[PDB]
């Protein structure tokens, strides 16, 4: 019922300055105050600031008032958040929650932010299939090597979403500024060189899909 | 200025088991407010009010505490309480978070399923070369890989990525991949991934030959 929904995951270089949106539902806009929190990738949560959706006021983590300017369009309930001058060490994911006078009640999904110099790479899928028989966990296990991409969410799922169980998919490692990222499934044996499996790697920043398909070598 | 510490910062229990919580304020709060953030995902209102359990919270949970310690203690863990917990306090300004708490579950030891894939032929068409090894499904989230080419042992090049605890089984998942030249590649013939777990005497190890 009540929904706080967030702008898509952003590429900034240094220097730029980016607005986030968090569009609210499901309650009165007005009131509630909007608060803006900052996960650093790997570190805790740090308070940003808050907004009064009324009057337009503001309280700041006195660290953040050079850097995020809230506002607020009353007329769609959404709330914004704009940072200026801004550095790798902007690089974190964004959350917009709403207090209900003791606690955050609610919260977006969050916004991924990366601030950085590098150049959006579209990522290269490679299939691993065993060497001529191979694995005997559970019995034969594939992959999919999806290598050199920049812009880090990839999305990874095995035809097209049906396999499920058995899959494993590694995070993500920087490596001179291009991501590499694997993905495991171990099927049963009877199902494998006999049924169609196809690793699907989607990466929206560069508009690639890639649907690859298993075969033996 | 109220900093809050959390301890620990990693706090492993068996499934059953009753575990405690602490957040230390620097200084003197009225109440304290507890988060709970499962990887992947925003946190989620647990306890407000220090002692108020949000909706959706079981009643295995209790927040405490008063001035400058609070508790979250959980009686019987249980599977999906595996996550990190914050704290958090505006008795002072500004608004601040503890440092977060892990809890990751304890089980049985397990050996990893371990496989080695050549270089696809598609790959060594674009003129590079990587051989990878998934160490799956083993509990001691501690491992050590060693790639050897003909022998030799290579820490050049190696790319390793571990995942979350898994939520079905408790277990931890690797990936190593060591990335080289095609023609370094076809300069050589045994490719070999030896892991080294305490499930284990010996190493366990995976090749092939060109």
């Known amino acids: 019922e009540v929904q706080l929904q967030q702008s898509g995951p952003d590429l900034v270089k240094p220097g730029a300055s980016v607005k986030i949106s968090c569009k609210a539902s499901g309650y009165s806009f007005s009131t509630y105050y909007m608060h803006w929190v900052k996960q650093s990738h790997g570190k805790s949560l740090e308070w940003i600031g808050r907004v009064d959706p009324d009057n337009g006021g503001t309280s700041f983590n006195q660290k953040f008032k050079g850097k995020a300017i809230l506002t607020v369009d009353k007329s769609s309930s959404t709330a914004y958040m704009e940072l200026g001058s801004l550095t790798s060490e902007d690089s974190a994911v964004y959350y917009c929650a709403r207090r209900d006078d003791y606690y955050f009640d609610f919260w977006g999904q969050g916004t991924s932010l990366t601030v950085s110099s590098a150049k959006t790479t579209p990522p290269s899928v490679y299939p691993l299939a065993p060497v001529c028989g191979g694995t005997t966990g559970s019995s034969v296990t594939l992959g999919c090597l999806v290598k050199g991409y920049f812009p880090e969410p990839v999305t990874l799922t095995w035809n097209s979403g049906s396999l499920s169980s058995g899959v494993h998919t590694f995070p993500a490692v920087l490596q001179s500024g291009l991501y590499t990222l694997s993905s495991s499934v171990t099927v049963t044996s009877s199902t494998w060189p006999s049924q169609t499996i196809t690793c699907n790697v989607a990466h929206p920043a560069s508009s690639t899909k890639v649907d690859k398909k298993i075969e033996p070598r | 200025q109220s900093v809050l510490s959390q301890s620990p910062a990693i706090l492993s229990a068996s499934p059953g088991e009753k575990v405690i919580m602490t957040c230390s304020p620097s200084?003197?709060?009225?109440?304290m407010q507890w988060y709970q953030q499962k990887p992947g995902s925003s946190p989620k209102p647990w306890i407000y009010?220090?002692?108020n359990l949000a909706s959706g919270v079981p009643g295995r949970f209790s927040g405490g505490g008063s001035g400058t310690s609070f508790s979250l203690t959980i009686s019987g863990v249980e599977a999906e309480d595996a996550a990190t917990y914050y704290c958090?306090?505006?008795?002072?300004?500004?608004?601040?978070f503890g440092g977060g708490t892990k809890l990751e579950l304890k089980r049985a030891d397990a050996a990893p399923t371990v496989s080695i894939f050549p270089p696809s032929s598609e790959q060594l068409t674009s003129g590079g070369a990587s051989v990878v090894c998934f160490l799956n499904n083993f509990y001691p989230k501690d491992i050590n890989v060693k790639w050897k080419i003909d022998g030799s042992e290579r820490q050049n090049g190696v790319l390793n990525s571990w995942t979350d605890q898994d939520s079905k089984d408790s277990t931890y998942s690797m990936s190593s991949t060591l990335t080289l030249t095609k023609d370094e590649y076809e300069r050589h013939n045994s490719y070999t991934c030896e892991a080294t777990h305490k499930t284990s005497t010996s190493p366990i190890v995976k090749s092939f030959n060109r």
């Open positions: 200084s003197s709060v009225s109440y």
């Open positions: 009010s220090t002692s």
């Open positions: 958090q306090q505006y008795s002072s300004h500004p608004l601040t």
